[PDB]
Amino acid sequence: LTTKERKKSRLGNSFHLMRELLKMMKLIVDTHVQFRLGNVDAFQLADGIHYILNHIGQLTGIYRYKYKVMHQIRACKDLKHIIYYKFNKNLGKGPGCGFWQPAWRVWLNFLRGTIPLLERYIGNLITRQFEGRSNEIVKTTTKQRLDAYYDLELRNSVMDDILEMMPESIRQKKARTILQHLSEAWRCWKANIPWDVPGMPAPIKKIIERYIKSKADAWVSAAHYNRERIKRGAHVEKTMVKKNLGRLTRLWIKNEQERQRQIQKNGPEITPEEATTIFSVMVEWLESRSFSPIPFPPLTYKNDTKILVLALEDLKDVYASKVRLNASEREELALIEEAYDNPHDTLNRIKKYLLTQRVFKPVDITMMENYQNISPVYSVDPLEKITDAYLDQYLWYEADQR
Amino acid sequence: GSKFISSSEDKTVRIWENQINVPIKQISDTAQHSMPFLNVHPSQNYFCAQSMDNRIYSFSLKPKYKRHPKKIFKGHSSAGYGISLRYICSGDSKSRLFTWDWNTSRLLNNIKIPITQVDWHPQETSKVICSGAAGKIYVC
Amino acid sequence: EINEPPPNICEQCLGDEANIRMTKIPQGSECKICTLPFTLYHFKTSKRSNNIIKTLICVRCATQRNICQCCMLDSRWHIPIQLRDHLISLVNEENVMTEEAKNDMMKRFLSLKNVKLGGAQITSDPSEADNIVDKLKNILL
Amino acid sequence: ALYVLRERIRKGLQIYQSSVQEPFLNSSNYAELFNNDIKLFVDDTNVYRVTVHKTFEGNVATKAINGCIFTLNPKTGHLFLKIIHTSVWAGQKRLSQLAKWKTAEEVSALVRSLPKEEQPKQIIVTRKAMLDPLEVHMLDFPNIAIRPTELRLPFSAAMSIDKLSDVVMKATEPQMVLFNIYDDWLDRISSYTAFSRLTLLLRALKTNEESAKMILLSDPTITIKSYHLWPSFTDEQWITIESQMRDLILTEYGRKYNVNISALTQTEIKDIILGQNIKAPSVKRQKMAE
Amino acid sequence: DILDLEELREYQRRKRTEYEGYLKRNRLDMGQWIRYAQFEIEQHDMRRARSIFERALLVDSSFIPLWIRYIDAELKVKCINHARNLMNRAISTLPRVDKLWYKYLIVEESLNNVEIVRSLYTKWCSLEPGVNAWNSF
Amino acid sequence: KIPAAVSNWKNPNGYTVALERRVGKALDNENNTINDGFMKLSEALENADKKARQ
Amino acid sequence: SHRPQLEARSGAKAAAYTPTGIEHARLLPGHTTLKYRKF
Amino acid sequence: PIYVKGGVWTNVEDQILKAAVQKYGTHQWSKVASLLQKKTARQSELRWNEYLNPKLNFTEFSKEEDAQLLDLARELPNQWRTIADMMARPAQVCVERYNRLLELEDEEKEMLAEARARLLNTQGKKATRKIRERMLEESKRIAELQKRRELKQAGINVAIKKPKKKYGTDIDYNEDIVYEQAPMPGIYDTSTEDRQIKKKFEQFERKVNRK
Amino acid sequence: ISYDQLAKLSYEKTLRNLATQKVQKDTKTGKITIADDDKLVNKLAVSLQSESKKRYEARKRQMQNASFINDKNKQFNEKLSRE
RNA sequence: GUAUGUCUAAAGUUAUGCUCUUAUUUACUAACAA
Ligand SMILES: O=P(O)(O)O[C@H]1[C@H](OP(=O)(O)O)[C@@H](OP(=O)(O)O)[C@H](OP(=O)(O)O)[C@@H](OP(=O)(O)O)[C@H]1OP(=O)(O)O
Ligand SMILES: [Zn+2]
Ligand SMILES: [Zn+2]
């Protein structure tokens, strides 16, 4: 079959179901024919019929199309199990039992059930064959197209409101600017970058702020609902769970940087007295310990190289498993390699960085999805990462030593 | 005698070997072509051809794989034909014939009287035939 | 829809019987003009007459042309529609045509419109018809 | 057939024990290629040739050309080659696999056509990938043994001989046009000698066609005979030509391989064929023996 | 380029198919409608142009420029009664827009049907319009 | 009169545009109310340290 | 290329369209009888 | 050769990046990176943030501003991003100032040509393909005309084949009027005008025929 | 300036362009044949064409006046710059 | 390799600064080989 042809020929669950029922019928009728055509004895017929009824599953993929027929099949199986073991008390094992009544009853009732269903189904089918399919298709909302529909409804509402507001009676092309503006605003909100376009009229800015708050509200609540759903362990779309992870991350970031803003806007949470007290405490502690502090690491160490080797090893541990690597990852690997090549030089570089570098490359993050609690994953830019490693290792060696 | 060219209605030209029946080169797509004629080019590198879009092209036929046009002969509203000897002379659909300097693509525009199938009397140096519609053959 | 319009059949066509018994299949065919379902009516003119007469066109179409639904002739004069339009064009005017759109979608659309065609406006109101007739007669002499 | 089936299943489960009863044609066993024994030799390299031409969309469009079924007999020098008319590709798609199938099909048909005496015993194949379907189409007759050559022989460049290519282009339909790949050589000397020369020639062609043709047409006074595929030379000038060709091959090796100077004898021989691979254990064997 | 009749017919068809197609997607792009109507005018088939205008009008009446364009198109071919009838219809539809009234007025003035311009002016003024209407009157 | 909305995200037509019109906000200035407390804090630390040190 | 919604599919056309006469799933008669109030 | 990205910002490269930013905006850093054969996405974005963005400033600090800076240092110890923000400057520059206070071309041209080519090419493959098909279609049409015209000249009249209609209700608009929505019924009489326009039409047709 | 004013002001203008230089009803048909001067309608037609032509050429001049990539963008940046 | 989309599949509708020669890059493409 050509792909087009193949597509055309995927006959639905009506036609196939019809075929299957006829297959069923064709079997038993054929068996009767055989019996009556002088081939097989009446006992053989009875057994044949029984076999057919108890193996409708195995003789005609009825279940394929309409799977609720498994119930019927199961019932038949049960009957067979019952019947046989009342039919084979003193009699041994073998195939020669007939007695097709109760199974036959089952199949009759299945047909009773389905006769309506097939009248509808095949009804519609042949109607389509004759009359074209209805060209007032209109699709319902479903989980799959809910969002798109929502958003279109929203932008229609917003657009309407703005037109109501706007006194000039502007053109649809001038509404494109409006709605596009809205879209940008939404994105800005998502980012947590304030959406302050200068040239607007205040009323419009108000209206859009409102509508994105509504949308935002819908979003956040939806996200929350999803996460409870995920916790429960319900049926949820892999894609949907990823979406929820994304949303919740953005939400988290927004929350976080809002907290930063808060911290800035009205001073640190720590009372200076409290801080002082803390300082006094810690000072007292080390005083009691005679704890000599960790120096800035010079060229003195016999351990320096050893220390370096640990950090590198640790870093390498990330990369030994995953053979396919990102660009950043590749860079990191290269750095590690070079460091092995040029240990002393690497050390020197590190030292220089420590002495000088107090502004670093920004840290990308993501959320690994433990389906209870999504965990933040900070990703430092490889060059600083080496420094961080070495410094860390050194600190631990010095701390534990001291 | 060996290599052989044949353009087509789909705007494609095909350099072939005499008998091989395997395209040495299909030409580019966004142009259009109608009349194929080789300029009596001293080196004999050149395969010229008229278009639908009022512009006769030139092609480096040696090698057959070469096909970069040097300079294009614009300004002859084409539904017709064109021929070379120095000069290329081709006629247009609407009005009249067009002599063109083969080196610079610009010369005199002689009146025809319509139709257009130009040719040169090759045994002489300067004599043309025009092919007008309905018994109007003009000679120069 | 509801069977609101009645069938528009002429006399000659239908035959000289005091009572015929015709049948109506509703939504019973696409018409011969506008490809559009309508109530197909049909009857044998006599009991033992072999030829059934079925209503070819739809009622809207019939009204539009102002014709019989079985004959395709004007309900007044029992003559070909084109011919009657020519006659009308000739007397009182220079141009009266009844252009059917030969494109399957547009024909439907045209049929839907409740608007008489060229000659149909004359032949609908009997006064105007009469006037046309007398003018025609005048033209003859 | 059943062995094929088991082997097929075995392949399906990636558990194929690489165990052959008959060893491959390596540079050592090259001698014992032929031994008063009716044979045939097959290459499927130039079955699916393509004109690369541009499209309206801008991407490449591959179109099939007429090809061949290089079907040689080293003893008689009778090169059969069924010229593949492009019509046979016009039927179907996925033509690289289909090339193999048509090849093996054609070969099988040919074998069927010939008598039980002239049904060739050991069939050698250039492309070891094309062996797999051949095995299938050789199931018609079980006596015809298959030989997967370890030594790659240049027969892609075989079709770049002038008259051959000419004939290929000429072909209008499903037809075969056999030739004697070497005629005068048979007349002068035994077949093996002829084959060595041929091998050299094809080798040179594979390295470079222009160089090859140049060597052949260095002298323009010499003329290629109407029947013969090659120019009929005198044996000393022939010798010279051969030497030149060899130099060409060595030159190529020097260029690409960058180690054509310090070659051992057997190794050198292998290099000429380009067949005895470094990883091939047969080579280790022969070497070990010496 | 556009030499013979049948060829011109084909051109007309193709162009229509383009225009029609673009209308199908955006029933409202009056720029597209009016452009199409201009095409009809250019073709010198007036009836089709009129039809286009009508359809366009139906699609969006409130777009005044469309009305104006239709009017002026009608004027172009000295089909003055059609212009007048249409303009009356425009007035009937959208009386409270002024430019339609003014368009009518100028048309009549150029026509030198001064009595009619008086009469219409009486009507317009009677509808308690803008002061502007009164002043112009 | 609404300004032609241009994004920092998504050009459909790929119109290049001025960099000022692209990137904006321009409101990092604040700096004043944020500091009220930090002075006290860092000063406190400095003084605390001094006290410890002496 | 791919564009926002502006002028909805207005059920004017769907009204003038011909009937289909298919039997959808939910238009099967569910809760035939109506309830009423005391009044 | 494939390799790990990095290096130094050549001025041409910087300019290219700026252009990209104008084009694609400040949040599609992948695309901009792609435009630069040497430099990464992250690198690019960082550069834009730090050096290249015009809504930064590199003007020297006033004495008051110096005071503000060093005071911030005193109070916020080496939290230089925060400090930078407070200043309203980029951070590296601020740090540098603080420190101060305390005391080949073929390749480049390749990427340029490619760059300019890209930036001046702002359509998805669907568009490009569509215009290609349009021009091809046009060409086909003219070729067809040339045949038809040729035959006419030759004396064989061939009617142009219709478009092979895609569906049963597909419309040819020259057959009959598209959807003749007639004018509003006539208050003022229109008969003479109808005649005149008809004549004009027929005359036009005649002219075309003669043309 | 509203479309109210711009109409009347354009009305006033074309009245200056004018200042440069019968009714018969069949009530049964409803057909109001206003037989008027055919020379004046022609003078309207030519004037109205000329007015539209003048405007048409006015854009053509203003289009041929001159941080962008294509025809549209240049104008789109011009739509931003006017603000 | 595909969805998919075009194409063909035969009967005649009655009118009178440049050209050139080459070698090299880079890019893209390629069910073509490795
Ligand atoms: O239990 P099921 O999966 O439905 O299979 C049963 C079952 O076979 P198993 O016990 O091997 O599964 C019966 O065996 P008993 O339990 O009765 O020993 C056997 O019945 P008979 O012994 O009477 O043959 C019958 O076989 P049959 O259908 O031939 O009656 C067979 O059903 P399947 O053959 O469909 O598995
Ligand atoms: Zn009748
Ligand atoms: Zn009808």
Q: Are D54 and B29 in contact (CB under 8 A)?
A: yes
D258 burial type by CB count under 10 A (0-12 exposed, 13-18 middle, 19+ buried) = exposed
Token look-up 């911030």 returns H72
Strand J near-CB residues (< 7 Å), B 1-40 = none
Task: For Cα atoms I74, I75, I79, give the angle at the middle one, nearest 5 degrees.
Answer: 120
Letter string b/e over residues H124-133, b meaning 16 or more CB atoms within 10 A of that residue's CB? eeeeeeeeee
Q: For residue B63, is the peptide bond before it cis, meaning its omega torsion is within 30 degrees of 0?
A: yes
Cβ <8 Å between C37 and G16 = no
The nt closest to D95 (CA vs C1′) is J31
Whether the CA torsion D9, D11, D17, D22 is positive or negative: it is positive
Q: Which residue type sits at F27?
A: L
HSE toward the beta carbon, residue D28, CA cutoff 13 A:
14
Task: For Cα atoms H104, H110, H116, give the angle at the middle one, nearest 5 degrees.
Answer: 135
- From residue C8, how far is each of A106, C70, G10 by CA, in Å? 58, 8, 34
Please, which residues have CB less than 5 A from ligand 2, an ion?
C 10, 13, 68, 70-71
Q: Which residues, 6 or more positions from H190, have their beta carbon under 8 angstroms from its beta carbon?
A: E79, E81, E82, E85
The count of other CB atoms within 10 Å of the CB of residue H123 is 14
Q: Are D105 and D84 in contact (CB under 8 A)?
A: no
The rounded distance, in Å, linking the Cα atoms of H142 and H126 is 24
The rounded distance, in Å, linking the Cα atoms of E98 and D226 is 98
The rounded distance, in Å, linking the Cα atoms of D231 and D226 is 10
The rounded distance, in Å, linking the Cα atoms of D279 and D282 is 9
Q: Parallel, antiparallel, or unpaired for β C52-54 and D122-125?
A: unpaired
Q: Which of I20, I4, I44, I3 is nearest to E134 (CA)?
A: I4
Tell me, using a 6 A CB cutoff, whether residue A65 lines ligand 1: no
The rounded distance, in Å, linking the Cα atoms of D250 and D245 is 9
Q: Which residues pair with D61 in a beta bridge?
A: D53
Backbone angles phi, psi at A311, to 5 degrees: -60, -45
Crossing angle for the helix pair E80-93 and E64-76, to the nearest 10 degrees? 160
Q: Which of C87, C79, C98 is nearest to C13 (CA)?
A: C79
**Cα-only R_g, chain I:** 22
Q: Which residues pair with C43 in a beta bridge?
A: C53
Query: Is chain E touching chain D, with at least 3 CB–CB pairs below 8 Å?
Result: no
**Cα-only R_g, chain C:** 16
Q: Parallel, antiparallel, or unpaired for β D145-148 and D122-125?
A: parallel
Distance (angstroms) between ligand 1 centre and the Cα of A77 equals 9
Token look-up 């060696």 returns A397
Q: What are the start-end ranges of the E strands in chain I?
A: 24-26, 31-33
The count of other CB atoms within 10 Å of the CB of residue B17 is 14
The rounded distance, in Å, linking the Cα atoms of B93 and H184 is 46
Tokens encoding A135: 């060209």
Letter string b/e over residues A208-239, b meaning 16 or more CB atoms within 10 A of that residue's CB? beebbeebeeebeebbeebbeebeeeeeeeee
Tokens encoding A17: 């179901």
Q: Parallel, antiparallel, or unpaired for β B136-139 and C23-30?
A: unpaired
Give, for H141, the enclosing helix (H) or strand (E): helix H125-154
The count of other CB atoms within 10 Å of the CB of residue I52 is 13
Q: Are H189 and I31 in contact (CB under 8 A)?
A: yes
Letter string b/e over residues A259-268, b meaning 16 or more CB atoms within 10 A of that residue's CB? eeeeebeebb
E30 burial type by CB count under 10 A (0-12 exposed, 13-18 middle, 19+ buried) = buried
The rounded distance, in Å, linking the Cα atoms of A262 and A280 is 28
Tokens encoding C19: 């009572």
Secondary structure (3-state) at B127: coil
Task: For Cα atoms A95, A96, A97, give the angle at the middle one, nearest 5 degrees.
Answer: 100
Q: Is the CB of B101 under 7 A from strand J?
A: no
Q: Are D114 and D176 in contact (CB under 8 A)?
A: no
The rounded distance, in Å, linking the Cα atoms of D100 and D134 is 8
Q: Are C33 and C111 in contact (CB under 8 A)?
A: yes
Domain edges within chain C = 3-141
State the chains in contact with I (3 or more Cβ–Cβ pairs under 8 Å): E, F, H
Q: Which of A176, H28, A158 is nearest to I79 (CA)?
A: A176
Backbone angles phi, psi at A24, to 5 degrees: -55, -55
Token look-up 């080949």 returns H104
Q: Which residues, 6 or more positions from D81, have their beta carbon under 8 angstroms from its beta carbon?
A: D68, D69, D70, D71, D164, D176, D177, D178, D179
Q: Is E88 on the interface with H (CB under 8 A)?
A: yes
What is the Cα E24 distance to its own chain's centre? 21
Query: Is chain I touching chain D, with at least 3 CB–CB pairs below 8 Å?
Result: no
Q: Are A361 and H50 in contact (CB under 8 A)?
A: no
Q: Is the CB of B62 under 7 A from strand J?
A: yes
Backbone angles phi, psi at B131, to 5 degrees: -120, 90
Backbone angles phi, psi at I20, to 5 degrees: -60, -55
Q: Which of E11, E54, E55, E81 to mutate: most H Cβ within 10 Å?
A: E81
Q: Parallel, antiparallel, or unpaired for β B55-60 and B73-74?
A: antiparallel
Helix locations, chain G, DSSP H? 12-16
Secondary structure (3-state) at A221: helix
Give, for A159, the enclosing helix (H) or strand (E): helix A146-165
Give, for D166, the enclosing helix (H) or strand (E): helix D162-170
Q: Is the CB of D51 under 7 A from strand J?
A: no
**Cα-only R_g, chain E:** 18
Domain edges within chain I = 1-83
Provide, as residue numbers in chain A, all residues whose Cβ is less than 8 Å from the Cβ of G22. 124, 127-128, 131, 133-134
Q: How far is the CA of D42 from the C1' of J2 (A)?
A: 33
Best probe residue, ligand 1, of A77, A84, A85, A88 (max atoms within 8 Å of C-beta): A84
The rounded distance, in Å, linking the Cα atoms of H92 and H58 is 11
Torsion-angle region of G11 (φ positive above 0: left; ψ -120 to 50: alpha; else: beta)? alpha
- From residue E132, how far is each of A387, E107, I9 by CA, in Å? 80, 18, 10
- From residue C101, how far is each of A162, D210, E111 by CA, in Å? 44, 71, 38
Resolution value (Å, 1 decimal): 4.2
The rounded distance, in Å, linking the Cα atoms of A57 and B21 is 60
Query: Residues in chain A, how many?
Result: 402
Torsion-angle region of C77 (φ positive above 0: left; ψ -120 to 50: alpha; else: beta)? alpha
Q: Which residues, 6 or more positions from A252, have their beta carbon under 8 angstroms from its beta carbon?
A: A367, A374, A376
Q: Which of H188, A143, I81 is nearest to E85 (CA)?
A: H188
B45 burial type by CB count under 10 A (0-12 exposed, 13-18 middle, 19+ buried) = middle
Q: Which residues pair with A367 in a beta bridge?
A: A376
The rounded distance, in Å, linking the Cα atoms of A304 and B129 is 96
Give the nearest ligand 1 atom to A95 CA: 24
The rounded distance, in Å, linking the Cα atoms of F29 and A71 is 73
Check residue A22 and report its DSSP letter: H
Which bound ligand lies closest to the C-alpha atom of A87? 1
Q: How far is the CA of C95 from the C1' of J15 (A)?
A: 25
Best probe residue, ligand 1, of A80, A83, A88, A91 (max atoms within 8 Å of C-beta): A80
Q: Parallel, antiparallel, or unpaired for β B46-50 and B35-38?
A: antiparallel
Longest dimension (CA), chain I: 68
The rounded distance, in Å, linking the Cα atoms of D104 and D71 is 11
Q: Is A5 on the interface with F (CB under 8 A)?
A: no
The rounded distance, in Å, linking the Cα atoms of D183 and D79 is 11
- From residue A47, how far is each of A33, A36, A73, A101, D285 by CA, in Å? 14, 15, 17, 11, 70
Secondary structure (3-state) at C66: coil
The rounded distance, in Å, linking the Cα atoms of D75 and D191 is 5
Q: Is the CB of D50 under 7 A from strand J?
A: yes
Q: Is the CB of A290 under 7 A from strand J?
A: no
The rounded distance, in Å, linking the Cα atoms of B46 and B102 is 11
Provide, as residue numbers in chain I, all residues whose Cβ is less than 8 Å from the Cβ of F14. 69
3-state SS of D233-283 is CCHHHHHHHHHHHHHHHHHHHHHHCCCCCCCCHHHHHHHHHCCCCCCCHHH
Q: How far is the CA of E22 from the C1' of J5 (A)?
A: 21
The rounded distance, in Å, linking the Cα atoms of D29 and D38 is 17
Taking CA atoms only, the protein residue closest to ligand 1 atom 25 is: A95
Q: Are H56 and H90 in contact (CB under 8 A)?
A: yes
Q: Is I73 on the interface with F (CB under 8 A)?
A: yes
The rounded distance, in Å, linking the Cα atoms of H31 and H48 is 14
The rounded distance, in Å, linking the Cα atoms of D26 and C123 is 104
Backbone angles phi, psi at D234, to 5 degrees: -75, 150
Helix locations, chain E, DSSP H? 5-25, 30-43, 46-59, 64-76, 80-93, 98-111, 114-126, 131-136
Tell me how far apart the terminal alpha carbons of chain B are, to the nearest angstrom. Answer: 30
The rounded distance, in Å, linking the Cα atoms of A268 and A280 is 19
Give, for D180, the enclosing helix (H) or strand (E): strand D179-180
Tell me, using a 6 A CB cutoff, whether residue A59 lines ligand 1: no
Task: For Cα atoms C10, C14, C19, give the angle at the middle one, nearest 5 degrees.
Answer: 115
The rounded distance, in Å, linking the Cα atoms of A164 and A166 is 6
3-state helix, strand, coil in chain H (%, to 5): 60, 0, 40
Which bound ligand lies closest to the C-alpha atom of C74? 2
The rounded distance, in Å, linking the Cα atoms of H6 and H39 is 6
Tell me, using a 6 A CB cutoff, whether residue A77 lines ligand 1: yes
What is the Cα C46 distance to its own chain's centre? 22
HSE toward the beta carbon, residue C38, CA cutoff 13 A:
28
